[PDB]
Amino acid sequence: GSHMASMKKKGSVVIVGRINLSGDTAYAQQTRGEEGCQETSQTGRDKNQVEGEVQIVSTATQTFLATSINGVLWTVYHGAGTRTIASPKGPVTQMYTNVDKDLVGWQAPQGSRSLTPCTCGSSDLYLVTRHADVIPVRRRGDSRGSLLSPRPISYLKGSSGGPLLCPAGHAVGIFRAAVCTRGVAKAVDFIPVESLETTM
Numbered sequence: 001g002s003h004m005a006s007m008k009k010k011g012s013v014v015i016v017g018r019i020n021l022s023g024d025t026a027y028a029q030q031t032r033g034e035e036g037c038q039e040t041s042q043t044g045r046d047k048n049q050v051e052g053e054v055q056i057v058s059t060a061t062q063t064f065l066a067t068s069i070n071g072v073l074w075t076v077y078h079g080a081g082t083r084t085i086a087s088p089k090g091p092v093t094q095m096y097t098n099v100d101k102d103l104v105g106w107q108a109p110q111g112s113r114s115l116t117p118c119t120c121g122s123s124d125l126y127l128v129t130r131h132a133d134v135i136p137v138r139r140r141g142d143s144r145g146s147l148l149s150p151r152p153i154s155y156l157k158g159s160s161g162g163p164l165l166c167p168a169g170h171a172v173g174i175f176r177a178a179v180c181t182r183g184v185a186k187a188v189d190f191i192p193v194e195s196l197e198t199t200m
């Protein structure tokens, strides 16, 4: 538009829930409903208590995941773009942005817990989805892994930004894209944690 005074501003990414991995059962929790998300996105002011490693996040138009590793909440650029995240004291600007890796990060919210980067060198992985499904994945390259049991793309949609973990619960990567044949996801593409650390 040419009329700057009426140009709009994109809202913040908002934490709307979490994937609870603290006990013996993985489950999704919602911490904010759609209306209060809308308001928090416009203000950038989110006073809700944050817990855990894997957050469910939303914009006005998309919902996906974000994962804390090394004190940074990481997600995908195709979900967040360059947006700020809502925080108790107002919007917080990304500290990392890499469109070429489809990667962004913000300082991790107070109250969150961070995963430890994996140093196991192990290829038996586990993908955690936004529905708290734990999907075994065999690592097949630097940034690829195969689903032991393929699933339709629908099952994975909304889970970008979620973690791949090793058997010890370390972070191996951040889920970025599905490798799809006729709508069935046989494999996943992920940002390796080493790539996160180089970005840092």
Ligand SMILES: C=C[C@@H]1C[C@]1(NC(=O)[C@@H]1C[C@@H](Oc2nc3cc(OC)ccc3nc2C(C)C)CN1C(=O)[C@@H](NC(=O)OC1CCCC1)C(C)(C)C)C(=O)NS(=O)(=O)C1(C)CC1
Pocket: 062, 063, 064, 065, 077, 078, 079, 099, 100, 101, 102, 153, 154, 156, 157, 158, 159, 160, 175, 176, 177, 178, 179, 180, 189
């Ligand atoms: C189903 C869940 C998957 C995790 C998920 N991701 C996607 O859907 C990503 C976003 C787009 O890909 C990208 N867009 C980018 C956009 C950018 O600036 C805008 C910058 C960099 C980008 N880089 C990528 C890829 C190349 C890395 C397309 N796509 C794919 O997975 C596609 N498969 C694919 O391309 O396979 C390629 C070949 C084999 C490997 C790579 C697919 C499956 C055919 C839809 C998901 O859940 N998203 S999401 O939460 O629903 C959401 C939409 C709410 C956020």
Ligand SMILES: [Zn+2]
Pocket: 117, 118, 119, 120, 121, 122, 166, 167, 168, 169, 170, 171
């Ligand atoms: Zn490990």
